[PDB]
Design an enzyme around this catalytic site. Sequence first.
Site, short mmCIF file in Angstrom:
data_model
loop_
_atom_site.label_atom_id
_atom_site.label_comp_id
_atom_site.label_asym_id
_atom_site.label_seq_id
_atom_site.Cartn_x
_atom_site.Cartn_y
_atom_site.Cartn_z
N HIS B 41 47.13 45.24 51.74
CA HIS B 41 47.44 44.42 50.64
C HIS B 41 47.56 44.85 49.63
O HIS B 41 47.95 44.08 48.59
CB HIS B 41 46.60 43.11 50.99
CG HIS B 41 45.21 43.41 50.49
ND1 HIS B 41 44.08 43.07 51.44
CD2 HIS B 41 44.75 43.75 49.27
CE1 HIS B 41 42.93 43.63 50.51
NE2 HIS B 41 43.59 43.87 49.68
N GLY B 143 38.64 44.33 42.92
CA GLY B 143 38.86 45.90 42.85
C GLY B 143 38.11 46.75 43.70
O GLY B 143 38.33 47.90 43.84
N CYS B 145 38.29 46.59 47.14
CA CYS B 145 38.98 46.57 48.23
C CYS B 145 39.34 48.14 48.87
O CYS B 145 39.41 48.71 47.65
CB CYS B 145 40.29 45.71 48.43
SG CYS B 145 40.41 44.39 47.95
#
Lengths: 306, 306
Positions: B41, B143, B145
Amino acid sequence: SGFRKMAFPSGKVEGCMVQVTCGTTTLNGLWLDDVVYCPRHVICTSEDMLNPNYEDLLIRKSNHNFLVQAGNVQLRVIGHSMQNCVLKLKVDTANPKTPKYKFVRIQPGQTFSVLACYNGSPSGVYQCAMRPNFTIKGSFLNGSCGSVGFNIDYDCVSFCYMHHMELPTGVHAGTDLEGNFYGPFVDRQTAQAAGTDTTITVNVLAWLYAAVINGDRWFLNRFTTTLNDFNLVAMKYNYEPLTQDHVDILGPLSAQTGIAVLDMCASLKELLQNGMNGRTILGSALLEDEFTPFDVVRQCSGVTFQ
Amino acid sequence: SGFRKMAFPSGKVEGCMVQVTCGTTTLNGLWLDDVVYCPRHVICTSEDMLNPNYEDLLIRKSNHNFLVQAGNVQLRVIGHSMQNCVLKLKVDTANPKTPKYKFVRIQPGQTFSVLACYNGSPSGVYQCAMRPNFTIKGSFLNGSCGSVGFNIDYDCVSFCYMHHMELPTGVHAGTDLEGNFYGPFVDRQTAQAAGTDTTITVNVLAWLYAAVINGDRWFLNRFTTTLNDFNLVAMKYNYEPLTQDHVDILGPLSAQTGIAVLDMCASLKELLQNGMNGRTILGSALLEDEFTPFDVVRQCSGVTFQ
Ligand SMILES: *C(=O)c1cc(-c2cccc3[nH]ncc23)cc(OC)c1OCC(=O)N(C)C
Ligand SMILES: *C(=O)c1cc(-c2cccc3[nH]ncc23)cc(OC)c1OCC(=O)N(C)C
């Protein structure tokens, strides 16, 4: 979101851990620049640990009696000295992995990460608080002496703890990196009273703010209190007295949550007097005191390190 | 002695964390050999995260649209591919700090350490369990991920988790390093039911053995039970059924403590039916289920890693 007991990334410290051998004793040392730091009781045999004369025992040792191993490589010891309860072994090689570092003496209630090591090799990492009585509630087995506690600020490691011993009560005692024991403990196998330990009030309040930030808020009540009234309750429950300095450091959290510090004390007062009634806060059924206010802001703001 | 929620030393993983930027999205990637792994993503804008067609969105991207930064150095992307829910960016440089590693898909109830990262820089480390419902109860902000969970066996890092998202309930979901989500979750911002979570029975028993090893033993009773009888109680309290496989892995702890597994179940049964009566076990007022039997033996035997 979510709140966890979070330790610092340990990589900078991993590169400093070496194995130190003297006679038949092996423990961990900290290799910074061209000096290796380790507990002085490395020079002791078992018959010496009742009432050791460290000065006399160190006199019988020369540089070549200290074997220092970083991984599989030999360091050569070219000087040795005793500073308080730590041995400082000068080696011929500066550690190429030496981080920017400082030695600090932490205050009770402050937290740090511990890298538990055996034979100079890291085993694990966890977050600890210096108890008000200057013990730490760690996880240490035989061989763990010389494991260190630390904080990191961007690229700088502040070493604050070196592990020395386990008291008969199962709690742990050690020194700063200048070799001064925290608390009244000594490096001899005798009876040592830890003293009454209290709860770190400012840390509990910090964690209650952490809870609110994260959605755990059933404990907020419709009451307030005063410093003096709350401190009456704190004394009854063996909590450290709250001071205006403590109120001041909680300022940022009160601003973030819009909950006045004295209102949060009134919530803490009711939790102390009524318990939790079988409920939980941040996954805990007791009041947690090993998060400082800085820890909460650090975790809830995502501060990173080089 | 002492028992702590202990994470693996994070140094080997710290050397693999990079920052990945695509458009205006920046998150963490894992740089192993000449491949960088990160959540797919990263290629999404906010208007795309409702019902993203990742295939179509990746088609609009070329190698030069992916900026990969390891510390202050540029990696150059020479190939990109999507594997399930992860992006694999081929870079022109093999990571010189690549540890021996494997990709593993862990089973529910297994534990791992998480290195929480922001902008490709480590923030902290903590120990997590994969819940029976395939969520993790972590600490992750915007932040984070691409932060990864892992285990270490001597010198080999087994990566098992990459962080992808936070569910509206505040718990966390992610994939293995082949990009397959744990559980039924998808990488789109929609309503996602986690499902009923249960307690990891074999882990609670492991922790009770840990307690006994460490001196916490008021909970040992004069009763025993049977697998079937205990499992009646487990069902009532939303505990995972105990199997003979679970009994078998508890063998080493029963041998160490001399407490038969079914006797420890009878202690657990009484704790479930009567509570703790305001007492604690290993510093906790609830039953802890994020220590596996291997974790307990590992911590109580001082296993180290290269
Ligand atoms: C240092 O490594 C060390 C460790 C222990 C010891 C034993 C059991 C639990 C525990 N927790 N922290 C330290 C613990 C005991 C030692 O000696 C008895 C010890 O090394 C010192 C040594 O061997 N001598 C003779 C000074
Ligand atoms: C990935 O870094 C990431 C993180 C979040 C997010 C926000 C708040 C808490 C939290 N816990 N784990 C992840 C969390 C949200 C993101 O986007 C909304 C996100 O990055 C993805 C992204 O920016 N897009 C548009 C796909």
